[model samples]
Target: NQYDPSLLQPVPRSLNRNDLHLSATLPFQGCDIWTLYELSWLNQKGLPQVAIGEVSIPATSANLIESKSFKLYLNSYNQTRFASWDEVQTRLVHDLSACAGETVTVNVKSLNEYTAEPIVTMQGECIDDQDIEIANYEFDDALLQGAAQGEEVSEVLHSHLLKSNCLITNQPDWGSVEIAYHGAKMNREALLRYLVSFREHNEFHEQCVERIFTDIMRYCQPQSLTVYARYTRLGGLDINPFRSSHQSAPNHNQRMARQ
Candidate 1:
C-alpha cells in the first residue's frame, strides 16, 4: 500500500485555471500534447514494465497537472504492479482527471514497428531573423497594439525567439511559437519583441500561452485564432500548449528540433 497511487504527495499536484478564462466569453479550445519517452512500472506478475508513449490534456480543462508533481506520481508506480497496460493507462487517466478536473487522453505508443523519421520544421514564415533593437524583456500587453488597420488577413507566423522564465524558479524556458489567424495585420516587429519580453517573465508555459492568446484577442480581436507553443523538453517530457477558437483540433504534436 506504500506504493498506492493516491498517497503520492510529492508525486501529486494540480494547476488551477481560475487564472486562464479560456472557457470564459472568449472561451477557446485546444490541448497540451506531451512527449513521454521514459516510463516504467511493474506488471501483474511483479515483473518490470516499460513503455514509450504520449499524453494529451485538453486546454478547456479547469486545471492542469503540475509536471514536477506528476513525475513523482509516476515514480510512485515503480513498486506497484498492474494487471495490464490497459489497467495502467486507465489508472493514470483517472489520477490525472482527478487532478486536472477534466478527462485526459493517453496513448501508449508502439515501437515494434519503429520507423525512421526526419525532423521537420513548422510551416510558417520565419521572423526571428528580423534586425531590430529590443529594450524590454518583461511582459507588456501594450506591445500587441497597432493591428486595427489593413485588410483582414489570414496567415500563419512563427518565431524561435520565444523564451520565458519559470514562475517558481527564475530559470529560463525556451520554445518556438506558431500562430494562425484572420485579422488586421499585426506589427511583426512588435509581436516578436513582445515574445522576447518574456525573457524575464516568470510563469508556467500554459499561463504564458493563455495570456498571449488573450492579449492578442483583446488587442487584435482576430476573427479566428490559434496559438501553439512547442517548448523544449524538460525532465524527460516536453510540454506543448495549443489553443484555438476552432472546435477542430490542429494537426497536433509535431516534435521540435530542439526537443
Candidate 2:
C-alpha cells in the first residue's frame, strides 16, 4: 500500500532534541540519522537510470513516526511509467520533497552501460574453532567494562556483512557494515557478534537503525546511541543509513569509491 503522510504523528516533545544527549561517537550534534535511499529506474527504452537521495526529519519535529510509511510511499513509483529519464527524475524529487515536508536532494545519473567487478574484504582478529586448545582473549571484556563505566570508547569494531531484501520488490541487498560507538562500554566480541547477526535479517534501512538503537539501549543502556550503515551500490546508487538518539538530522556524505 502507498504510504499516507497523514498517518505520521510528531514525536513527543519529551523525546525531542532537548531531552537527549549526543554520543561522542556521533559526528554532529542536534542531528538524528535518517534514511539513505538509492532508487533505480528504467525508462521506456529499457535503459538504466538511477537517483540517489536522502530524507531527514528534524529530530525535534513530531513527524518521525511515519518512516516506514515513507518507505512504502517511495515504492509506489516503481510501476509508473515516465516518458523521459529527466521527467522521472524531476517527478521523484518533487514528490519526495512534498512527502518529507523538507527540502530534499535528488541526484540522478544515467547508467546505460556500467560494469564493475565486485570485491569483498574482511578485517580484524580471526578465531579458529577447529583447534582444541583455545587461546582465551581478554580484550573483549576489558572494552565492555570500560564502556559500561561510561568511558569514551573510540575503537572500530570488526566489519561484517549485511544483507537485506528490498522492501517493495523483495530483492537481495548485500553490503558490509562498520560500527563505531561510545557510551557505556560494550564487549568487542559481543558487538562483533551482534553485527554479524544481520546475516539473515530482513528490514528496511530505517528500521535497521531503530533496531540497532533498541538493541543497544536494552542490553547496554548506553548514555547515547548512534547507528550508521553504508550499503553497497546497486543500480549505480548506494544507501547509507544513519540514526542517533539525540539528533534530528544527519549530514550527507558524498559517495566514495570503496562504498
Candidate 3:
C-alpha cells in the first residue's frame, strides 16, 4: 500500500543522534557510505525480493543511525508488499529520512553487485614500517605536536597500526588510517606517534576518525585534508567515514587488509 506507513509496523530500535557527536563549525562534507550485504523484501505479487545496494547519508546530518538496528529495520520490509523497486526505494528514503531527521540516499543493485566488489586498497605511503618510538597508549592529541614537512609538501599517509577498543564492548577494533593533505609536511615520526596514541582509546570508528580529523585541522592547519578509515567489519558491518575540506566527491573506496 503506497499510503500505508504501517503496512509492516517496522519499529526502529531506540536509536538517535544523542549517542554520537556532530561537528559544529562544518569545514568538510561527505557521506557515511555502507555496503548493504543483506537485503530482502517482497513485491506486490507475493514474491520474496532478494537484493543488495549501497546506502549513504550526509555527514552533516544531525545524528547517526544505530547500524545494527538499521539492519533490522530494513528487514522489516522483507514480509511487506512493495509495488516495485522504486516503491521500495521510496519507502526506504521516507522511513530513513524520518528516522535520521534528514534526507538519506540509497541505490539498489543486483545480487551480483555483492560478489563483484573486490576488497579495496588505500593509495598512500605506508608508514607502518617507519622506525619510531612510541611510549604513550592514551588518547593524546598533543602528541601530534612537532614540525611540519617544512618544504610545503603534499602526500597520502597510512598506518595499519591504528587500533582502538569499542566503547560498548571494550573489544579491540583493528583498522588503518589513510590521510591525504596538502600543506607543510607533517613530521612522519610525530604523526606515527600520534596515531599510536589511540592504542588504549575506546570509541566508535567514526568517532575516532573525526577526532583525528579535528586534531589535524586544528594543529596542522592544512590547506586541504581528507581522512578516510576502513575498520575491519564489526558485527557484520564496516563503517567508513570520508572527511575533506577542499576536495569534492569521488573519494577513494579502497579496502584494507584488515577490512
Candidate 4:
C-alpha cells in the first residue's frame, strides 16, 4: 500500500457531454458531490487513522476524477504516513483539483461528525405510487413531450426507481432523483415514466443527471429547474450529481438511507 498519487486518473467531462450535443457552453451550473467512507492513513507515529471525506467537483471542470481511480488513490494512503489531517487534506485537494482540472473542495469529517449527519430522503412528492404502465425500458426523452400541460406552478417531484448501468462496466447503479422546477405543471405520471425510462440506460452518474436536466429543459421548458440524484454507494463511495438552470441555491449534501 505504498503512497502513489499517480493512481488518480482523470476523465474528460467533454467525452460524455459531447454526445448530448453539449459543448463549449453548458446550459446549467452544478457540481458532483462525493462521499468517501473507506479513507484511512497512517500517522507519523505509524498509528492507523480513519475518517470520512466529502469532495465537490464543479460541473464546469475540464475533467472528472474517475471513481475507480479515486478509490485506488485513496487506498494508496492506507500505509502512507501523514503528520496530521491537514496534510492529508492538502494532498487530497491538490490531487483532486489537478485531476478535475478545477479547484475541488475536500472536507475531512470525524466519525462523530459523519454520524451526526441525518439520513434523510428528498423532501418532495414521491411519484413512485403512480399506477402507470411501462413497456419501454430504454432511455427516451419523448416521454416528457406531453408532460407539461396543467396550470403554471412550482413543485418538487421525486422517484426512487431511478436505475442505470455503468457505461463501461455495465454494473447496476441505483439512485433516487429529485426534480424541482417552477413552470407549467408537469404530469407526475409522465415525469415518473420519463425517469423510469433510464432503467436500461447505460451512462455515468453525472451524465444521467445532465441528461435529465436537458430533457426537462427542452421538453417541459421549466422557468427554473434543478435535477439532483443520490446514488447508492459503490465500493464505499457514493456520488450525488446536482444541476440547475438557475443558481437558485446550493443543494444539501444529505445522504439517503440507501447511501
Candidate 5:
C-alpha cells in the first residue's frame, strides 16, 4: 500500500576492505554497475508499468547495498504509484545515495524504449585453454608474485574461470574477469592460475574484485590497471564491479555472453 526505501539494507564496505589491510586512501577508482531485470510499479491510473533499471554505485562509497535487501526494496514499488518516472528515479537516487553515503545514479528505461545489445563475449585475449596442472583450488596471491618482473607490455586478458562462493550463503558465484593493464608483461599462465585459484574462495562479488585489484597492484604494479568482472544474475539482478587505477567507469548496458 506504500513505498518504502527502508527495505534496502546497507552493508559497510570496510568490513572486508579492512581485512585486506586497505587504508582509507584507496589505490583505485571505480564503481559497481547493477542491472535490474525485474522492476514494476503502478501508475496514478492504477495501471501496471514495467521498466529496466541501471544503478551505479561508486567504489569509494562507504557502504554497499545488500543484494537481497535491494531486491526487496524494488519489490516495494510493485503496488505503489508514482506521478511520473522522474519521481521514481528521484526516489531511487535519493535512497541509494543515502544508503551508500555517496552520490548514486539511477536510470529507468521502459520496455519499448530499451533495446538490449546482442550477447557477446569480451574482446580481450581469452586464456581458458592454458595447459596447466591443478592441485590447488584455494585463493592464493602467491601465484601472482612472480608475474611482476617482466618486459613492459599492454594488453587485455580475460577468462571464464573466475568463480567464488558467497561469503555468507556459500552459494557458488560464477563470473568472467577482464584484466587490462600497461606495465610489466604479466605471466599469462600465472595470471590464469590466479584467476582459477578463487574456485573455492568465499567472498562477495565486489570484495573479490577489489582483492584482485589490490593483489595485482601490489605485485604487478601496473601503470594503469582495470579489473572488471560480470557475475551471473542472482535474484533478477546482475552485478558488475569495475575497479581501475587510471580509467573511467565503463558503459553498464553491455551484458556479457554468460550474463
Candidate 6:
C-alpha cells in the first residue's frame, strides 16, 4: 500500500517533544514485540558510508506520532555534513531521543566498502531459481498466528522492494528485509511474498512497521507481534528497525557481513 505523501509533513513544533521517553529502567523483554530499521548514509565526499543501528520502540509508542517523525528527521541528516561518524551518531541519538520523548540509545558504527550478503531464496534456494511469483502475493493474515506464545522463528520474506526516498536528498533507497517473529506461526510463502511486494512500496522504516503491524492485526489478528528487519547496510551504516507490542529483550551483537 502506498503511503499518502501528505502524511510526510513535518511534525509541528508545539508538540511536547520531551513527553516521550523509552525507559531503560524496566526489565528487558525479548522479540515478543519489536521492529527493526536498517539506515544507510553517504558522506559529502561522495564516498559511500553506513551506520549500523537499531531503534527499539515500545508497542505503546505505536500511537505516538513522534516515532515516525524521528524517521523523517534522521533522513534530514543525509545531506547535512558531519565531521566524523561519531558526530553523526551523536546527532542522531540526541535528536531521536528528543523526538521520542525518551532517552533512545543509538548504536552506530562505520562500515567498509563491501556488498551485503545476497538475498537468499526461501528454503536456502537460489533467488533466481525459485519459481514463486513475487508480484502475485499479498500480505498474509495468517502470518500473525501464534504470536502470543513468544516462540521465535526465523522468517525470510520476499515481497516488493520497500524503497523510501532519502529524507534529505530524496535519493532512492534499496534493500532486502528479514524478520524473525516470535509468538506466532506466520505463513512462510505469504511472508516471503509480502516482503517481495515491497518492490513498489515506499515508507520510512518506522512507518513500514506500523503498516505491517496494522496489516497483521487487520488480517491474522495476533495477540502480540514483533517486527524487525535487517536492511542491507549503506553509507557505511546499516539501520536495523525493531518494534513490538511488548517490551523487547536485550539486543545481541549480531553483526552480519553488511554491518
What TM-score goes with each of the models? 0.88, 0.50, 0.82, 0.97, 0.95, 0.48
- Number of backbone clashes in candidate 5: 0
Rank ordering of all candidates by TM-score, starting from the highest? 4, 5, 1, 3, 2, 6
Clashes of each: 3, 13, 4, 0, 0, 52
| Alpha carbon deviation, residue 27, candidate 5 (Å) | 0.2
lDDT (tens digit, per residue) of candidate 1 on 99-152: 676788887765552367556667678778888888756678788787546687
Candidate 6 on 113-192: residue-level lDDT in tens?
22562433222222223466554434343444443343444343333345544454445555434443343545555555
Best by TM-score: 4
Candidate 2's error at 156, in angstroms? 5.1
* Residue 218 in candidate 4, Cα distance off native in Å: 0.3
Regions of candidate 6 where Cα sits further than 4 Å from its true position: 1-95, 106-130, 135-172, 181-184, 233-237
lDDT of each: 0.75, 0.47, 0.71, 0.89, 0.89, 0.45
Model 2 over residues 31-135: C-alpha lDDT tens digits? 233333445545677564555444444333333434444444545545544577677656655655555455445545444322463343433332212223324
> Which candidate, 2 or 6, would have the higher TM-score against the true structure?
2
RMSD of each: 3.0, 8.3, 4.5, 1.3, 1.4, 9.8
Better of 1 and 5 by lDDT: 5
Stretches of candidate 5 off by over 4 Å are none
Give the range where candidate 1 is weakest over 10 consecutive residues by summed lDDT. 7-16
Cα deviation at 87, candidate 6, in Å, is 10
Identify the superior model by lDDT, candidate 3 or candidate 4: 4
Which portions of model 4 miss their true places by more than 4 Å? none
Candidate 1 positional error at 55, Å: 1.5
